[PDB]
Amino acid sequence: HHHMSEATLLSYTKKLLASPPQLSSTDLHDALLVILSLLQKCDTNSDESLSIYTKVSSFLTALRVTKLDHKAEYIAEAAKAVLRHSDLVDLPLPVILDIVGTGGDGQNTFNVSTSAAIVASGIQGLKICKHGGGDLIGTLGCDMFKVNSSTVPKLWPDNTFMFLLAPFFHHGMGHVSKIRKFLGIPTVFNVLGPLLHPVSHVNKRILGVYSKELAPEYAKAAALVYPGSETFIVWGHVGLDEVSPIGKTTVWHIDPTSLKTFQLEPSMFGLEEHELSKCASYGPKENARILKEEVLSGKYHLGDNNPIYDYILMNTAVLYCLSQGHQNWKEGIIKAEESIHSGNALRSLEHFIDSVSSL
């Protein structure tokens, strides 16, 4: 009877069981708003809670089976519906970039994403507002829970680097957290993280995706969620949501002043290829120590063929090149190298850690 009811949710699920399916991209937006209302108001241990988890499970599964949650317009409406339950950052009116992946690629490489974001943030004229999650920033002695829509505006003016932990912004993602665990299958939610940036001022971004087949739809989705933001969608050919240190990577270029694809190889950066096995994660604590006491403290050099160092330089070089409007990959390398050895990258990180500590 009320729009925000099991009855309304059921009617949207029934559009999904029709041949062909009759669920529009805007219906998916509307359905997700009903699911989030139904889940936020859940009465613990009530029959109503079981019935609701039943109908949300049913909807989300139907949506996976039809594959409409892999269509650009549907991904965008889904991100938009989720964002309605989010704390967005209100800022008073350098190039501001984000770098992040969908995940879901079944890989466990070093956190190059946060590392490149920190090294890029050391380059004069760049500002980095990375949205993610992760624990890595956690283990450098700053409470990431202190960073929310209320504190980001205080941190914003004097910081070249910032990290936003998604769960402290996206209360809608918090509401589906338990049913996602219970479902144990991928859903539309597995690909929304990168399209939920709560800072409107971000100009450019690298968005990594787990699959070649998603990339073109994810590029069209990114264009709809971040209108006029110049964007690389990246897919490493080995199956990786960032620029791979082995083999090729494809870039899908959303260029608002112009769709177009181009191919990246480590040789274009003046770097050796490295196998994924040589570029592994040692978990958050050790990743952070490696980053802070080795990479950012200048223990390694361009030309040392240190695999992790190379991997971070390359991802940094793409951030720089994206930021300046050119494909001079070796120049982004030089700029990444200078950010580290000048101490600027470590200073950018330390200033953000001190800033957070002060809240």
Next chain:
Amino acid sequence: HHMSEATLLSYTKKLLASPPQLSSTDLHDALLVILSLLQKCDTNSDESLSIYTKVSSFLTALRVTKLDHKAEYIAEAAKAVLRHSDLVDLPLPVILDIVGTGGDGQNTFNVSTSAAIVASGIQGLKICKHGGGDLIGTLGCDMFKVNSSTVPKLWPDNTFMFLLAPFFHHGMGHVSKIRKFLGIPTVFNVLGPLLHPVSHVNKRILGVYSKELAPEYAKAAALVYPGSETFIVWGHVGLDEVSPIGKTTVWHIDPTKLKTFQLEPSMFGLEEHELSKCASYGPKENARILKEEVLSGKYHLGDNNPIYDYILMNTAVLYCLSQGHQNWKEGIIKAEESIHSGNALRSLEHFIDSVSSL
């Protein structure tokens, strides 16, 4: 433990593959995992939340693939539910059943029970009707007394028996709450007619709600009842019975191939009646009409009483199925004779008395 959420999840994943990797025996095994897990959901705990999430996921994925519209899947689903059933063991006439899937959005009179009773008064015929009884319940019959253990006692001396489904199929009891919560059709919606606990039944009418379903539903009926001559019926107004208005398609399984023909009340010498004239007056009222207005002999062929015509027609189809011909007007004469001889009221009365002295 193999009967676990993790095992169910792996079955759901088979359904999300392109193309799906869920075989019909996979559905059988998945359904035993489901009925086992749902048995443990006696509270609204988080474990229950989790199990309902995964069963809903599985059942919904099955519906959207449409594997639950395929005969092999429907038969394997029936076999899995029957594992949780009390089945009737009998010592080794024609024995008939008449029942529908429901799910047609109609609210028509209980013509199956009524036609089963009238048919049971035609000499040579034995009726063991299986159904979801509330009607026969209100005629002073303790239908809980009719179970696995008591059916063999009632079998020898009764031309008519009614078997109330929820007292046989514990497995259906377990999925009752989640099916209500799902609000969408699943495979469970079409299993009722395929769950008969007496294997000696050798002919039946099974109504379906959909033209589209009927062909695959006839195949499933042939897999579930290999030793059975069967009519699947769909009234074109959208009805799981021989319709008192417009045409009814019949799919015929003759275990000698899917034969088809068409029924129209004129073939029975009957006027057409709108569904509105053949409405369900509720269990207590339906039982009153059937025993007072119909089995008493108050109405005859030619009175054009809608309920009475509706019962005569469905009885006549049972008779013709039983005899291996299409003499529909002979069917009417045999039905009219079972009502007006009193033989029908007596057959029902014998059963109610058999159950009373149990």
